[PDB]
């Protein structure tokens, strides 16, 4: 069954995004990005099921902070992502992966929309583009994100 | 900057190969694969310089086992993977040897992969891997011989 393939890809892209976000962490601040957004048209509110429910309108650095620990907590959750073959994937696993991937996407969009200038200065566009292309190919082949969620980068996605 | 990209990719492909090899590990045995090979024409013997100098001729299951332990230990090394002066050299050796797992799978276990319907996943991973190492020339053309016709097709 497809669970292991989806699992390793979810982990792999998770690693890539933090690396990519890491190169521009100095350019993403409270003043530059008072909120989590992907252009004027797209703002995102954070809400993890265990700690924070009613979504918080917060800055981009913090949302991603909330986001990355949240995803990682699931990756370190043996009951969700088995480190042993003798532990099955939970029945709701697929649903969990989609939510992770859905929120991870928002990090690409913010980087593209607000900080592409800093990426170009570092001559790091190929890495972002390569990571993004591979990511989009992954989620589209398995419909892991709804079309509406992908709205902020639709034109870019079409060129690929 | 460049080191971090290679680092994250090196870690990512370590995960992918282990997952992919995982799908056929029970079918990769002492009887099926008496040696680490990529077809009759290409066999590999294990060595890591520190514990094993003189390369040992061992089975594919055992070679890959030795390998992943060796690789996994370095990824957990903060002095190598936070950069050290020799980082690139370390990364290339890892990548050079991880490639051999792909080679063994294609040559010895492709039928089982298709039966398990993981051929697309293997090809996607391999495609990503080869494009990655070629851009920074992290593996010599000589090492890629066992899959050169396939690489040309990519």
């Amino acid at each position: 069954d497809l669970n292991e393939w989806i699992a390793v890809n979810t982990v792999d892209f998770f690693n890539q995004i933090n690396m990519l976000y890491g190169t521009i962490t100095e350019f993403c601040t409270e003043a530059s990005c008072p909120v989590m957004s992907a252009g004027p048209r797209y703002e995102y509110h954070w809400a993890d099921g265990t700690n924070i429910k009613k979504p918080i309108k917060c800055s981009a650095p913090k949302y991603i902070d909330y986001l990355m620990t949240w995803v990682q907590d699931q990756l370190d959750d043996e009951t969700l992502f088995p480190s042993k073959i003798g532990v099955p994937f939970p029945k709701n696993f697929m649903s969990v992966a989609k939510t992770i991937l859905k929120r991870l996407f928002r990090v690409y969009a913010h980087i593209y929309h607000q900080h592409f200038d800093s990426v170009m200065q570092l001559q790091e566009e190929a890495h972002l583009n390569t990571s993004f292309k591979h990511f989009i190919f992954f989620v589209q082949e398995f419909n892991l994100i709804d079309r509406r969620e992908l709205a902020p980068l639709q034109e870019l996605i079409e060129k690929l | 900057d460049l080191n971090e990209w290679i680092a994250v990719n090196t870690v990512d492909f370590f995960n992918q190969i282990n997952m992919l090899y995982g799908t056929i590990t029970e079918f990769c045995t002492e009887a099926s694969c008496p040696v680490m090979s990529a077809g009759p024409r290409y066999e590999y013997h294990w060595a890591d310089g520190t514990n094993i100098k003189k390369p040992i001729k061992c089975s594919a299951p055992k070679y890959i086992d030795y390998l992943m332990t060796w690789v996994q230990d370095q990824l957990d090394d903060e002095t190598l993977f936070p950069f050290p002066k020799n980082f690139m050299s370390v990364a290339k050796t890892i990548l050079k040897r991880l490639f051999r797992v792909y080679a063994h799978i294609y040559h010895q276990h492709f039928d089982s992969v298709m039966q398990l319907q993981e051929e697309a996943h293997l090809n996607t991973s391999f495609k990503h891997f080869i494009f990655f190492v070629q851009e920074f020339n992290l593996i010599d053309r000589r090492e890629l011989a066992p899959l050169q016709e396939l690489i040309e097709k990519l």
């Binding site: 699992a7 390793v8 982990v11 998770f14 690693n15 933090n18 690396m19 976000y21 890491g22 962490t25 650095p61 913090k62 902070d65 990355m68 620990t69 990682q72 990756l75 480190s83 042993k84 073959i85 | 971090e4 680092a7 994250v8 870690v11 370590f14 995960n15 282990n18 997952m19 090899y21 995982g22 590990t25 890959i64 086992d65 992943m68 332990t69 996994q72 990824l75 957990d76 993977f81 936070p82």
Partner: peptide
């Protein structure tokens, strides 16, 4: 805040699985 690190999360090897 300053958790902008590259975790380099590993999945366990095929042995240890």
């Amino acid at each position: 805040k300053r958790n902008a690190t590259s975790p380099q999360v590993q999945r366990p090897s095929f042995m240890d699985y």
